[model samples]
Target: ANIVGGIEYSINNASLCSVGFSVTRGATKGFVTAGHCGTVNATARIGGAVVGTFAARVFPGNDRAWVSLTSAQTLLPRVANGSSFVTVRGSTEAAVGAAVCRSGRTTGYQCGTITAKNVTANYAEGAVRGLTQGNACMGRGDSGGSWITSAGQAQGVMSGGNVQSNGNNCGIPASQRSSLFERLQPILSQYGLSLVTG
Candidate 1:
């Protein structure tokens, strides 16, 4: 019932969104994702099988959540990077302009550069501050996907994006949309958790 990072998952009543990564808080194991993916207490199911439930959820102000898995599931330290998978090494926040890659249900795996830091991303839900902006855009259903660097450092979780940010005055192209992700450091520290790594 457990799923690896980069794969799509759903909480019984919601649409499928990508998984971010496996994590551990003390002896307890769990996974990370976008809070917009589901409401609190929602059952996180993969392929119609219940794996976990949302132990915490944050939206508008932030876009991150961690699901504490049920006894039947186990969190794995891996990322499905398209053609090949990568081992998550750590959760060091990558610097601006650093090369990074992400995996999602819509795009599979794509690489791009960190465009900005502490970005104030305007969303209909609310203004999300402290987000990291990237040039490589993501599409629908890609929410909650993992963003990692070349050296296997975990960066953040996919928040949202605009595919037509280019024509829409955002100046980013359709092929390279203006994407926003939730920075991982604060959340990791807040939860007293560590990224499951090699």
Candidate 2:
């Protein structure tokens, strides 16, 4: 089942950070969440056990981070969403109108279609460009989650969702998601990190 819990700042351990998703990178397993969740050199744990450290982190301009495991840990790209396990088969930018889904701790598993691409999100940190827009719904704890296409291709990490009076939601776009992952791939490769596909 998909796990949901409060995320806290690494330093204070009291304030809330964005919710995140678990991912496996190359030989080392870790989580790929929003960079705004915390700063670099910060620590992260699952159930209070140190799982990894915030290795490459970016915020404001971009919203991405890689939690590097302290030790070799087994990881699976797929996540259990209570009823079923969703396989994360590959990393590619999804095209507009592509079907997308997200597995979030707070929102559980939600699906939607890509709306726009190369859009910019203005946040407290700054403006982040090249984000995919979708019609998925999420909340505070749902940040740093996974955005995957129906074909099992990863789009991007969830940053935030739109809120409506009816409690409905959406996401950035799929094409922008494609670009972000493309940029991240090289950086991850330098660290011997490969996107998990299984």
Candidate 3:
């Protein structure tokens, strides 16, 4: 009901980002996002409402993080798709050239084809490897969002991309604009967490 993937959340009431996916650490329920979004123990809020605390983070070398939800928050195995929602069925890695879609606060829903995998992005923070490259449009405030295959399989978490457009238009040709997402399975394994799937 609450704390679902692809929803908007901010750090300490600023630094807006989107939820990557819903997860569980045994009995604890939470969601994943880009590590660059916030630091460990940072307060995550949705519309000024406290949702959870970032329990773990990995940046620079990788872009992955997980939050531990509060007792009142509910976890859902779904991600926002425009006005609707798509059920998360699994965390199956999609091959290169596969059709994928991403959901973010800045861009909402945008689709594209995965062009490559294991991409290394040298950000101002540092170089992060193992990211998947796609033609989807992502920009500022879209970090830590959700990326999934057309079949409803969780793929990656929004990391870095060309934000020159600020996410205003997604119609740009794929060759001109592209995005990067951190694979979901690795993030889950890194934290010993399980995805909240339908």
Candidate 4:
């Protein structure tokens, strides 16, 4: 009973954010997502069939993480786009004011403009620096999802909006509907992983 980035997923039967993208490190196959999605124990599932476990997750300070699938789970380089999918091309941090789109479990797809960059977000847990700011309205469960440009460049993972999580409401007022994200470039480089593309 869970979902991530518009895809169904769960961690220890507890509903978490959306799924971001499938990733691989050597023979270990997994998916990349918001760091705040989980912690140590790392139990997870998709469609309530395939079993996956969290390899690592970092939140508050920074929102990004990856899950290693143990069962016959398969990771794809495509994203759910309405009725079809959009293949990931690669990672390219867009400039400010660029048009971008995102996908979340609660909200299928929404686009907005990049408002700022290198922004820092402070949460009740801790503080995450070097985030990208956007005008896109992120819903609950949307955290840990994908933030991509129309050209298919991998940008960042959903951190949270003023509301900051799924399994709940974003009760944020319209005048303050902003979302923050953890950049993908550093996360990929830091983890020594490559962004899978089609």
Q: What is the C-alpha lDDT of each candidate?
A: 0.82, 0.59, 0.88, 0.75
Candidate whose lDDT is highest: 3
The worst-scoring run of ten residues by lDDT in candidate 1 lies at 165-174
Clashing residue pairs in candidate 3 are: none
Each model's TM-score, in the order given? Answer: 0.91, 0.77, 0.96, 0.88
Write one digit per residue (lDDT tens) for candidate 3, span 1-198.
Answer: 387678889898779999999899998988999999999999998878888899999998999999999888888889899889989999889899899999999888889899988899999988999889999887788899999976789998999886664454365678876599999988899899999889
Q: Which candidate do you rate higher for TM-score, 2 or 4?
A: 4
Question: Cα miss at 89, model 4 (Å)?
Answer: 0.4
Q: In each prediction, how many residue pairs overlap at the backbone (N, C-alpha, C within less than 3 A)?
A: 0, 8, 0, 10
Model 1: pairs clashing at backbone N, Cα or C within 3 Å:
none
Model 1: per-residue Cα lDDT at residue 88: 88
Error of 3 at 181 (Å): 0.4
Per-residue lDDT over 1-198 for candidate 2, one digit per residue giving the tens place of the 0 to 100 score? 222211322422543343343455555556666777777878766556665678777777777787776664455657545567777677777777777777666667777677777778877768887677777666556667677776777667776645445433434443332222213343355445566666
- Report the lDDT tens digits of candidate 1 across residue range 47-146: 8788888888888888999988876776777888776788889988888889888888887787788888888877888888888988765678788999
Question: Could you tell me the lDDT of residue 46 within candidate 3?
Answer: 86
Tens-digit per-residue lDDT, 1-198, candidate 4: 222235757777887667887767888777788877788556777766646777887777778888877746666777776776767899888999898888887777777788988788877788888899887777777887888888888788888777644432245543466788888888887777777787
